Write a protein that binds this ligand. Structure first.
Ligand SMILES: NC(=O)c1ccc[n+]([C@@H]2O[C@H](COP(=O)([O-])OP(=O)(O)OC[C@H]3O[C@@H](n4cnc5c(N)ncnc54)[C@H](OP(=O)(O)O)[C@@H]3O)[C@@H](O)[C@H]2O)c1
Ligand SMILES: COc1ccc2cc([C@H](C)C(=O)O)ccc2c1
Length: 304
């Protein structure tokens, strides 16, 4: 199923995460995205940063051409990188992403991060950035627009902005049972903004940002015990948890069996006591925990 965004477009509640580290050959993105779509994923999440938009766009285009899906059946997201926050760079950045994927529009374009970087931090009025995002929606380059990695104060800046034309439709943020973002989620619901969860499975645990001493979400004993009870897997439990919270949930896998397993999130339900047990895991643990972000004046996790 899908969720009605606050601008009237619709978003599939489960999305495919397409990020892979640079040691994974770029042709895997084409292959796995084709698998995702065959498996039943209709929401595909990419970004300028992932250096995979040609491959992902080709995968979407390949599945339109062969007859499996229609463009308007696919919800494709891309993201504005933090070196392009200056308002005059926004539209050309988006048009670059589209030429790379060879598509006419993105369903969703997001400000990837509030932590501006020089075109080595930058200072930019993100309200100016949002104005340019708005014009990309008027132009039809993006059906919807939203933000990513914003905390409550940052989201409030946009929402309170003088003569705002469009609210962000979503805020895509790290969100999983160790960092469930309850309060931020409550804020979003009260504003008709969708929370989209990334690293819903614990992240890829990339050395560049994630301490390998951190606990592995999918080895959690409460997730394991729910997986045993439901006869599913800890991944499916963590994904189903989010849908029942009203959170749209991304799942990255580059494995043919796991990609298919993840669509089974629609085949079962957790009870109220399951949801409470999982809610009890929250431990203010964000996996991305890096000097590269932490020392930024607009670091989202300062207000915690
Ligand atoms: N906006 C942002 O700044 C931001 C930040 C991070 C991520 N994202 C987006 O969100 C996407 C997903 O999050 P992520 O990349 O952090 O990874 P994730 O969805 O948390 O997944 C982490 C690991 O779980 C494994 N997995 C998938 N299904 C599984 C299953 N059924 N059982 C066991 N393991 C399973 C995958 O490994 P295998 O490939 O070996 O299956 C994956 O590497 C990203 O790809 C990207 O699209 C955005
Ligand atoms: C909290 O500010 C962040 C945190 C994590 C991030 C992760 C990523 C990766 C490359 C991603 O998958 O998008 C990018 C930007 C991010 C900004």
């Amino acid at each position: 199923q899908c969720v009605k965004l606050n601008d009237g477009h619709f978003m599939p509640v489960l999305g495919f995460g397409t990020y892979a580290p640079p040691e994974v050959p770029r042709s895997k993105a084409l292959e796995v995205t084709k698998l995702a779509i065959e498996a039943g994923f209709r929401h595909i999440d990419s970004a300028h940063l992932y250096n995979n938009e040609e491959q992902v766009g080709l995968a979407i285009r390949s599945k339109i051409a062969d007859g499996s899906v229609k463009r308007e059946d696919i919800f494709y997201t891309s993201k504005l990188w933090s070196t392009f926050h200056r308002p005059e760079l926004v539209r050309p950045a988006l048009e670059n992403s589209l030429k790379k994927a060879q598509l006419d529009y993105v369903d969703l374009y997001l400000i990837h991060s509030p932590m501006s970087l020089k075109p080595i931090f930058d200072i930019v009025d993100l309200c100016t950035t949002w104005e340019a995002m708005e014009k990309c929606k008027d132009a039809g380059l993006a059906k919807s627009i939203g933000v990513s990695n914003f905390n409550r104060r940052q989201l409030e800046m946009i929402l309170n902005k003088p003569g705002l034309k469009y609210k962000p439709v979503c805020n895509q943020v790290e969100c999983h049972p160790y960092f469930n973002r309850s309060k931020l989620l409550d804020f979003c619901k009260s504003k008709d903004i969708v929370l989209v969860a990334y690293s819903a499975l614990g992240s890829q645990r990339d050395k560049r940002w994630v301490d390998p001493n951190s606990p592995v979400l999918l080895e959690d004993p409460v997730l394991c015990a729910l997986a045993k009870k439901h006869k599913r897997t800890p991944a499916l439990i963590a994904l189903r948890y989010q849908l029942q919270r009203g959170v749209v949930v991304l799942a990255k896998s580059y494995n043919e069996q796991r990609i298919r397993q993840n669509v089974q999130v629609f085949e079962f339900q957790l009870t109220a006591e399951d949801m409470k047990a999982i809610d009890g895991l929250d431990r203010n643990l964000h996996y991305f925990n890096s000097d590269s972000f932490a020392s930024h004046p607009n670091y989202p996790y300062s207000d915690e």
